[PDB]
Amino acid sequence: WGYGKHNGPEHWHKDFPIAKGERQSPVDIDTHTAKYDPSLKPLSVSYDQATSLRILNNGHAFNVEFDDSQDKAVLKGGPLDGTYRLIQFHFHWGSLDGQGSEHTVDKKKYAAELHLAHWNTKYGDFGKAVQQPDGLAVLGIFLKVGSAKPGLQKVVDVLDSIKTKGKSADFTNFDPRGLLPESLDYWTYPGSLTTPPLLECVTWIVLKEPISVSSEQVLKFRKLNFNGEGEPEELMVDNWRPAQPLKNRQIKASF
Numbered sequence: 001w002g003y004g005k006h007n008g009p010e011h012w013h014k015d016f017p018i019a020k021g022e023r024q025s026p027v028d029i030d031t032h033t034a035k036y037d038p039s040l041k042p043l044s045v046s047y048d049q050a051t052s053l054r055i056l057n058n059g060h061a062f063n064v065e066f067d068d069s070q071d072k073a074v075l076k077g078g079p080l081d082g083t084y085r086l087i088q089f090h091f092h093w094g095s096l097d098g099q100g101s102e103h104t105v106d107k108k109k110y111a112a113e114l115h116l117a118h119w120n121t122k123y124g125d126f127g128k129a130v131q132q133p134d135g136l137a138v139l140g141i142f143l144k145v146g147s148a149k150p151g152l153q154k155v156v157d158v159l160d161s162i163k164t165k166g167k168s169a170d171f172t173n174f175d176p177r178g179l180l181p182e183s184l185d186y187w188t189y190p191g192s193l194t195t196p197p198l199l200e201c202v203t204w205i206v207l208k209e210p211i212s213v214s215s216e217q218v219l220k221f222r223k224l225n226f227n228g229e230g231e232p233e234e235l236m237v238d239n240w241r242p243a244q245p246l247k248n249r250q251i252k253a254s255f
């Protein structure tokens with residue numbers, strides 16, 4: 001699988017039949033159809049004690065991994081029941097600024113989309129939670145081109161180091177709080193992972209308010225490679241999946 005003409009999202013169903021499931025992600029968020037639910041509690045992000053370990057290029061994106069042996073960086077409240085631990089974060093970007101995000105808003109596509117993956121700590125480990133309907137919690141944040149994001153420069157600088165597939169780099173003392181918008185207003189719905197195995201275990205939380213990053217920050221993302229060192233060079237762009245049918249599911253709003 002990949003995002004190429006021959007291995008793209010339109011071919012995933014072949015190896016991952018769930019691709020055509022009932023709670024597939026990403027989706028289009030119709031703001032006029034989303035339902036204001038007053039029983040929704042405010043989001044609770046506790047990332048003051050976070051511990052980043054490394055940055056890796058897995059051939060489809062770059063992941064910033066965290067130590068999840070303890071409740072260092074946790075997500076609770078909102079639509080969630082119990083505590084979710086931050087395992088990693090990554091992005092999805094496009095070739096141009098008109099595309100990149102996975103979720104859309106009234107059909108509108110952003111430059112990129114940031115995903116912070118969490119797993120329910122009653123299941124004990126990541127591998128076990130992916131076997132549960134409420135196993136994961138993904139915090140989605142849209143990225144628009146404007147002013148630089150100071151809190152994001154550190155990631156940008158280390159990309160040169162992990163240009164190709166398989167490369168990894170030590171990445172400690174990175175505070176994720178720097179990637180968060182002012183507002184914690186969100187939309188929530190039952191979905192899946194947007195990449196294979198596409199397991200239908202995710203509780204999506206997409207923030208209304210986007211973060212802006214500079215043209216130059218975003219440009220460095222696009223210099224990454226899908227291919228491994230020594231192979232023909234294939235630029236890492238458009239690593240996003242097209243919106244899926246909501247199919248009965250209802251999108252709730254915290255605002």
Ligand SMILES: [Hg+2]
Binds near residue numbers: 130200
């Ligand atoms: Hg699941």
Ligand SMILES: [Zn+2]
Binds near residue numbers: 115
């Ligand atoms: Zn993602």
